[PDB]
Every structure is written in C-alpha cells, then in structure tokens.
Amino acid sequence: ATVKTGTVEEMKNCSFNTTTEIRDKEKKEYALFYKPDIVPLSETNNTSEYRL
Amino acid sequence: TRPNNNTRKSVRIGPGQTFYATGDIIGDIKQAHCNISEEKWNDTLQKVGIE
C-alpha cells in the first residue's frame, strides 16, 4: 500500500495481463486485492510475483 | 461496520463476462469492528452461568 499501519499495508496493488475481447490482444490491468487470496508464488524468493 | 469508502471497477475478460474488483479504497483506511454493550454482555455471561 504505503505499509506503515498494518490495516493499510494489506491493500496490495496487483497488476496482471488479461485476455481482451479479441483473444489475440492482451491488456495490462491492475485490481486491488488484500491479504490471503494473494499467495507468494510457489518457488519464488520473496519477489513481487504472486499467485491466486 | 466497514468504515472505508470503497470504489468498484470491472474488467471484461474475453467475451460476455465481466469481473469485478475493488478499484481503490477511496477514503482513509480504518479498522472493521462490531460494537457490543459491555453491560448487557456481562449480564448475559452471568445469567448463562447461573443456568
């Protein structure tokens, strides 16, 4: 988020590439998500990469 | 209650179906809570204890 207060830290800005109305075209979009649904990507090393 | 004003956005994924998610919590971020009167709760725990 900002980090700081634990109640704010949790608001993870989460950017990703999603399929557009045309299947060939792809758009980079972000969705605000918080805590548990966002899981550190398996086999990464404390990186910015996460999984659902 | 949940105090923070939260905006909403949607994303079209492929044809038809849209996906919904929070755009950004638009206010300040305060805690989420449940108020309960103490009086009535301490009256309850003892009344249950009696029975």
Partner: antibody, heavy 126, light 110 residues
C-alpha cells in the same frame, strides 16, 4: 498551549518549488490531522488536504493533482508541503492548522474543525 | 464543485441581529452535517466560531448561533458590536474526503 509554528516569508522565481512547513508543539500532533490552506491577499481561503501524521497518507485537493505533495517527519513534530512549478497565481499566505481527532475505528478526515492555526507564511511568486 | 456562495457584505445597527447565509448543493449538505463557521480580523488567522452546524466552541459567546436548511446554512449574530468588523466564512465537507471552503462575506458595521 497548542502551537503551530511556521517558517518566515519566502520569494521564488516562476517554475520554482518551495518547501512550506510547520512545527507542532504544546500537544501531541500524532493524534490529529493536519490540513493546509491558502489565502491570497484579496481572497478567501483555498483548501489543501489533510496529512495523517502517523500513516503519512494524504488526499490532494482538486486543481492540484500532485502539483503540490505533502510529507511529514514525526521525530521533530514537523509537517511540510512541497509546492512545485510556482506561478504568479500562487502568491498567498499559507497556513498550517490542526483538524479533528483521529482514531483507528472511524474515519474523521473530512471534518472542517480547525481549532488551532499557525502564524501563516508568505509565499510570493515573482 | 464551486465555493459556497455568500453575500459580499452585510451590515446593521449596534445591537442588531445579523444573519449570514451560505449556499451550496444537496450533495454538499443534505448528505452532511459537516458544517462549520469561521471569522477573521484582517491580518489574523481565523477563529472557529461554530461546530456541527450550530454548536458554539469554547471561547465563543452566547451571541452566536446557527442552523442549516435545504441547500443553505446560516450564522446568527445577536448583539452586533463594532468589534464584529471581520470577515466571516463558511466551510463544509465536500464529500470524498475533501473540504469546501466558502466564498466568505464581509461584516461591516453601522
């Protein structure tokens, strides 16, 4: 009693930036929001938003849109504004003022309750 | 999204009750009781005169009152004094964690 102490006067060239700041004293600043206003010498006041001293989070007023950014340093009870690309239109007295109480469970950032004000500071753009 | 509209100036006799009005929109007020009033002697930072539409702050005497109605609100000053020659301003919650500052009105005295 509650003090809000500002810097002295300053003058800048167009396109320049200025830091405007204030020190809180006589109470604990961590418990309140700090808001900022401007008053041009012939006008009413313009409002700039609140900085939560603890979080360092803020909301910017309409017609600024990051033209001005705000920061804080809790170790010295000091609030600051960083005002960029100054135009002659920006000449005004800048004031530091204390807003409502802050608490973790309910939002109280919009409250127009400015009980304590600083001395004001002159910002001239020449 | 404009400033609260206020009379440029108002006036009256010593002892006279003066009411100062401020106008906005239903989004600005109907939704909120987040209304306050300030006054300032020229050359000085403003004093808060009213909290929560009509509540006197400590330090504000029982001369000052107020109310809200529809898209407007007002301050009532009983007992007009020469000393009231100060600017008066409204301000209120704009919504979306931002604050409206009013245009202001000047007190002049007779």
């Amino acid at each position: 009693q509650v003090q809000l102490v500002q810097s002295g006067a300053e003058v800048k060239k167009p396109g320049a930036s200025v830091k405007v700041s204030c020190k809180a004293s006589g109470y604990t600043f961590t418990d309140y929001y700090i808001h900022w206003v401007r008053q041009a010498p012939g006008q009413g006041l313009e409002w700039m938003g609140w900085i939560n001293p603890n979080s360092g989070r803020t909301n910017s007023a309409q017609k600024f849109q990051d033209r001005v950014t705000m920061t804080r340093d809790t170790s010295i009870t000091t609030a600051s504004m960083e005002l960029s690309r100054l135009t002659s239109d920006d000449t005004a007295v800048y004031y530091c003022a204390r807003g409502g109480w802050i608490s973790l469970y309910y939002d109280s950032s919009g409250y127009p309750n400015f009980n304590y004000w600083g001395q004001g500071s002159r910002v001239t753009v020449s | 999204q404009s400033a609260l509209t206020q009379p440029a100036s108002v006036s009256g006799s010593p002892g006279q009750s003066i009411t100062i009005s401020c106008t906005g929109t239903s989004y600005d007020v109907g939704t909120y009781n987040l209304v306050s009033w300030y006054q300032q002697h020229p050359g000085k930072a403003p004093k808060l005169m009213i909290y929560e539409v009509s509540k006197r702050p400590s330090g504000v005497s029982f001369r000052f009152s107020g109310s809200k109605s529809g898209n407007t609100a007002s301050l009532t000053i009983s007992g007009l004094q020469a000393e009231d020659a100060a600017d008066y301003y409204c301000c209120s919650y704009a919504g979306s964690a931002t604050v409206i500052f009013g245009g202001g009105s000047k007190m002049t005295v007779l």
